[PDB]
Each structure stands twice: as C-alpha cells, then as structure tokens.
Amino acid sequence: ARRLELGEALALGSGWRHVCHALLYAPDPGMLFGRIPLRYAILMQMRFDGRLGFPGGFVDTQDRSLEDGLNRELREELGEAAAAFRVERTDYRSSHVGSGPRVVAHFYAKRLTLEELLAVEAGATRAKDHGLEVLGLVRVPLYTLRDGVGGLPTFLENSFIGSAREQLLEALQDLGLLQ
Template sequence: MTANGRSGYSCMDDLKSHPLPSIPRSLNVRSVKREMKTFAEASALSFYKPAAHVCFWAPCYKNTMFGTYNAAVMMHLRFDGTFGFPGGLINRGEDILDGLTRELKEELAYNPAVHKPITYDDYHSSRIVEDKLLVLHLFVVELSMDQFVSLEKNATSAEEYGVEVFGTVRVPLYTMNNKYGGLPAFLNNRFIGCAKQELIMALFSIGILTDDQIDELIDNANNMKLAPNRM
C-alpha cells in the first residue's frame, strides 16, 4: 500500500479505476476541481499532450535549530527560475512510466535499480491545462532515506544538470518561530504551473499536513509582514 492509498496497479489501463484523490479543504475550490480529472477522464482527452512529474519523499525525522521535520520532500529548480517536480512531457504512444523514467534519467540521473522503480501504485492525480491542451500526471513516490540521499547526490551528474535543471532542493517542512520562515516562505517562491498546489496535495496525502495545518500555512505565507527580513 502506498501513500496514495492503493496497491495492485500493474499497467496504465489499471489506473482507469483510480478515483480522484481527497483534496485539502483550502484547495477544494472550483478552479482546482475543474482542472482535476480522474485518470480515465484524462486518458479520454486524446488530443491533450501528457506530462508526468514525481514528488519523491522519504520518512526522516530531523530536529534542527530552525524547526523539526518528519520527511524529506524533493523539488528542483528549473531552467526558468521556478520550482517544480522532476519529470516532463511523454512522447506520443509512449507508456507514462517509461516516459517519466526517461525524463528522470535525464534530469536526475535516476536509476530505477538503485533508487527504486516507480510503479502505477505511485500514481496520485491528473490535472488538465485547458489553454495548453496538457494533461499533467503526478506520482508520489516513497523512498528510503538512503535512496533519497543517493538521488540528491547523483543529481549533479545528470545530463540536464545546468541546462534544464539547476539542482534539487529539500522542501523546508517546518514553520519557524516568526511564523514565516520555513515552509510559508518557501511557498512564496515562483512555481511552475500547478506545482505549488501539487506540493500541498502531496503533503496532505502523505499525512505530513492536516487541513488545519494547511489553512494556517497559507495564512502565514500570505502574512509576509511577520517576516523580519521581508523584501
């Protein structure tokens, strides 16, 4: 069983029975719900171009002088200066997992034999971008901390490092005493497309954040006046 709550999907077609994930209260708004599609609905949009991205995470308890966190969650800095998840466009006729694996090799030097192969059980959700005719599939993949750290270390040897991607980051999952430093401040970065909402959804599905914590997080992120060194 995965953080996505399911198991036993062996091929792309199996995902057609996958329901919509539960959406955190703060994202349960019309604009988000309109874009979220079940895999079956998304696959029926044959003229949309698919892309797949992955949120790698690993359980890891760390108590630092800035805050405490229970998981390492990976995002990366992209060529355009925004944060997003590793992954990319799937070629016409290509299996989604094959395309995702190809992209991850290019961007992260990901090696399924070392870092754990991604399976359809790791599928989380799909969203459409109507004006770009895109369907964006998100996978949420739990690694061991050893696998996660190996992926971080390998990333600088990837073919696309310094071209399409400028390094992985661990998302700071705590909120500092000033109620802004850490995750609220991180959320005020620029994110590609719906990646910020995908991050919040992934943290909710994994069980790292509850509805109440997400509400508070968004309030704190919006409340930049609490930051001592605001720009």
C-alpha cells in the same frame, strides 16, 4: 487547472500531450538545530525558468505507458541514482488540465529510503539536464520557525510552475503534515 479522472485523461485524442511529474520523499528522523523535526526529505527542483517544480517531463510516442515515460524522464532529469527505483501506477495521485496548450499533467508521489533520496541528490550534477533544464535540487522545509513565517510558509511564497504548488500541498495534506 481542472482536475480530471485518469480514465478521462487517457481517452483524450492524440493531439493532447501528456506530462508526468513526481514528488520523491523519504522519512527523515533528523532535527534542525537539534529541536525541530524534519519529518521527511521531499525533493523539488529549480527550473531553467526560475520557478520551482517537480522532476519529470513529456511522455513520447514510444513510451508504452505513462509510468514508462515518467521513469525515463526522471532518469534524464536526475541521473543514474533514479534507476534504483520505479514510480508505478500505485504511486499515481492526480491529473490536471490548465488553460492554453493541449497538455495534461499527471502527478505521482514515490516513497524512497533516505539513503536512496540522498543518492539522487548526490548524483544529480551528472544528469543530462543539470545546468540546462534543471538548475538544482532542493528539499522542502516542512516546519514553521518561531517567527510563524520562516520555513514552509516562506517556501510557498516562491515562484512555482503550473499546478506544482497545489500538487505539493495536496501531497503534504495526504502525508498528514498540515494538521
């Protein structure tokens, strides 16, 4: 997929559709097996097509902004606990265009408290999309286990939608997790 500057994406003609997705994350002081730092809780979802992706969806003709569309979709996807926050332009990270349909994909990362993130997980089964478009939420393991394979490297071998794997890796880099 080609990366576009936000200005260029916003200048695309009306035939282009805009989709927005968000990486929700929270600092986590927890330790797996009492010794492996978790560092952050970072959410993805298993999608209806058997691929991992981020929560979000299409901006429609009555969204006044990309961010209004994103928050509307997040709340459909994830349920009422997503109404505890708004993802904003300050959280914007990137825009990409893939091959095929006229779709531009905008990506955001939003910091939550761990309590807010847990609340999103705890309420997700009541979301409109649960058991339809969204098959379940999962956290991303950020550590690599002693065999050098288990954890993040194996997680990254799963199937991902569109540019989601690249969006994840860019965000993990920006968080200082790939040093």
